[PDB]
């Protein structure tokens, strides 16, 4: 199963003991500089990435604003403030301002999907797609069609206190 990779995580994030859950903490932890660590944006990757095949996981989501999750290409830039956009190699859903969004660019796409509790992510590296479904009825939330050309990692971001993300298999 998937687990969050502590050496990637922004030092303000708090990862649960079982490495399934993430929230934003009160201050930056004193953690080693690592070139793979997101030092400004509030991101963390899973420890496993994928270069072929089809892969599923699920993400339980908080009801309060401040999260985004999906996939990132391995070459996503880790240092300094970087845009949270498909061009930077992030393909994600987000809860911000009480609305759900697919993080398209230059404008995000508001999703009229109703309340979300847990989302299934379906990554298909053979056809080139990442898709998101609300698990209660498997309604389709969004699909990004991408010709992935490198290893792709599950991506999580929490930029506000009071919300969370948690991996499930």
């Amino acid at each position: 199963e998937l687990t969050l990779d502590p050496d990637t995580a922004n030092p303000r994030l708090i990862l649960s003991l079982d490495l399934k859950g993430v929230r934003l903490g009160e201050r930056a932890q004193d953690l080693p500089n690592h070139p793979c660590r997101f030092d400004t944006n509030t991101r963390v990757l899973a420890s496993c990435g994928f270069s072929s095949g089809r892969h599923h996981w699920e993400v339980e989501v908080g009801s309060k604003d401040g999260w985004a999750f999906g996939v990132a290409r391995e070459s996503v830039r880790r240092k300094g403030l970087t845009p949270f956009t498909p061009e930077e190699g992030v393909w994600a859903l987000q809860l911000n301002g009480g609305q759900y969004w697919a993080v398209t660019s230059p404008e995000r796409s508001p999703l009229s999907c109703g309340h979300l509790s847990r989302v299934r992510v379906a990554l298909d590296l053979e056809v080139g797609a990442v898709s998101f479904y609300a698990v209660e009825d498997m309604r389709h939330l969004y699909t990004f069609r991408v010709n992935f050309q490198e290893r792709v990692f599950p991506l999580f971001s929490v930029c506000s206190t009071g919300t969370y993300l948690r991996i499930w298999p």
């Binding site: 985004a68 403030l81 987000q94 971001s157 930029c159």
Partner: peptide
């Protein structure tokens, strides 16, 4: 949101 800027730091997402």
């Amino acid at each position: 949101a800027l730091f997402q």
